[PDB]
Amino acid sequence: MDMTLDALNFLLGVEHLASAFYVQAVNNFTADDFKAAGLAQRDYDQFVGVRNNEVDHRDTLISVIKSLGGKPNPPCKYTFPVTDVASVLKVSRTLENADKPAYLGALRDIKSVELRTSVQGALSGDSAHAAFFAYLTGKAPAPGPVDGPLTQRHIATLAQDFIVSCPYPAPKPFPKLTLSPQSGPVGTVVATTCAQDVDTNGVMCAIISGNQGTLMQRPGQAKDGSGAATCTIPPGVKGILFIAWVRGRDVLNVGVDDSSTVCGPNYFLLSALGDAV
Amino acid sequence: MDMTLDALNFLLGVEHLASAFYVQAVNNFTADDFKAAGLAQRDYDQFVGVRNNEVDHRDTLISVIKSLGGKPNPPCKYTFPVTDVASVLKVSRTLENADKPAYLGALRDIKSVELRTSVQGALSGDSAHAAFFAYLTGKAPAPGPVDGPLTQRHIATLAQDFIVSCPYPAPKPFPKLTLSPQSGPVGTVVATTCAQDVDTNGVMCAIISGNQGTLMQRPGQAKDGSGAATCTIPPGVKGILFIAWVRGRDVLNVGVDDSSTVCGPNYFLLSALGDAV
Numbered sequence A, B: 001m002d003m004t005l006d007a008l009n010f011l012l013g014v015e016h017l018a019s020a021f022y023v024q025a026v027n028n029f030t031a032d033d034f035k036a037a038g039l040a041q042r043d044y045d046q047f048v049g050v051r052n053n054e055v056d057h058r059d060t061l062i063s064v065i066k067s068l069g070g071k072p073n074p075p076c077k078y079t080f081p082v083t084d085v086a087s088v089l090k091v092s093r094t095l096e097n098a099d100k101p102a103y104l105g106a107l108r109d110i111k112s113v114e115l116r117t118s119v120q121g122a123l124s125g126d127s128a129h130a131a132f133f134a135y136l137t138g139k140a141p142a143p144g145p146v147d148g149p150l151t152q153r154h155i156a157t158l159a160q161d162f163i164v165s166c167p168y169p170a171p172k173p174f175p176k177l178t179l180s181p182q183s184g185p186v187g188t189v190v191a192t193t194c195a196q197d198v199d200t201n202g203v204m205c206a207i208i209s210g211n212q213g214t215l216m217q218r219p220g221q222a223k224d225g226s227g228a229a230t231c232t233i234p235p236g237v238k239g240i241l242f243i244a245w246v247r248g249r250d251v252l253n254v255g256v257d258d259s260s261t262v263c264g265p266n267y268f269l270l271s272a273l274g275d276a277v
Ligand SMILES: [Zn+2]
Pocket: A015, A018, A053, A054, A057, A099, A122, A126
């Protein structure tokens, strides 16, 4: 089955959300707001550039889908937890960090050499966006060598806090997995809690890394007696991690197969050379 | 017919060069040198991170090539003149800006879905490196929406000043195309001069953009009577540009077909929102 149109319309959903955020944020914040938050004119300028780039990413997907005889998805209805400039930068970082696995997963389904070149070229742009927002928020712009994929439903899981409703059947999220803390080095013990009362029998932690793939462990129990399941960041991983609860070892490569996913994933910002110290 | 090994060994040549540069740069410069140049500890830390990431990109290509039964290319012999931090940053930006079209071109030849996912994941990392070095040198980290490909020999042309010799038959560069100026906005008139004498019969300027593909124009002549050919940055382009001389108009998509290339390409840093003000 040629899944090209499916993949493109999924990416269009991703870019409708991102473009809506940046259009609204540029509308509501000025360079003076950025400067009051300690940023420079060129940071606001690049922020407008990100808006323009994401509008292009959305419009290009619309054009390509139409050229293939498809019907482009409309926007959904969104909500963004924006108050001050700092929150704008955090939301931006969150969106761009989820962009990359979305594009990487979708590229597995794009049949054409030429269309892969175009889509990869947009992934490259969103990776530059991610590096910019990392740097502005004190995170390493390039924390590791390899970014990895996630599935469409995994991406829906990352996006769900920003979606109020969709007017068409979009990819369904898994329940949200809350991580505490959501950043830190190898060896960090992460308390994990699920938004729904899922079956925890046989649950394992999947730590999804770009450089090592999926690494499995059986969860621990929180030392504070709260009953939360813990997952410990294992050695050898590099870059941004995604942590999920999965059914046993049913799946070796969770980034390309969500058939065992129970809760999550959510992102974890692994410490890296380049973080503010 | 399956060009996967050819593409991977070409990328290995690219990453032998980049990793060699960053290894020697870290040996020669310290965090105190970076701080004396106005940078912060986190910028030196990220620089070491880039070295580590590029070493990983190289080593991963070696492993994959062996796993496919191929013989990995050894390093070439390089020349990287060592002066100051400003030069380190400029060379770094130059390498990362060239390694993105290298990966995008090579990805056209990689047959396996799973190998494409891995290689795209490294391209994403190099795009983050490029964004970091752009920002530290006062250029927009994300100057446009789409990065485009170049051919193997185009990449060899960009790399040629760093290569002393190779101990195996490597892709032969085209002559260098010098561009004056090498940055500016739409409408900039660029004086173009080739390193070798070329028959000018039917030569066109090829402006190679990621968002609009290759745009062709007949060269102009410098107004100062200097007799140098000129190419004018056309409307609508976004992001980093590559400018080459090509012969005739039978090849339209120069980023994927170098069979009409005569001189260049060389890079041109198009002005963008995010450049230092
Ligand atoms: Zn995008």
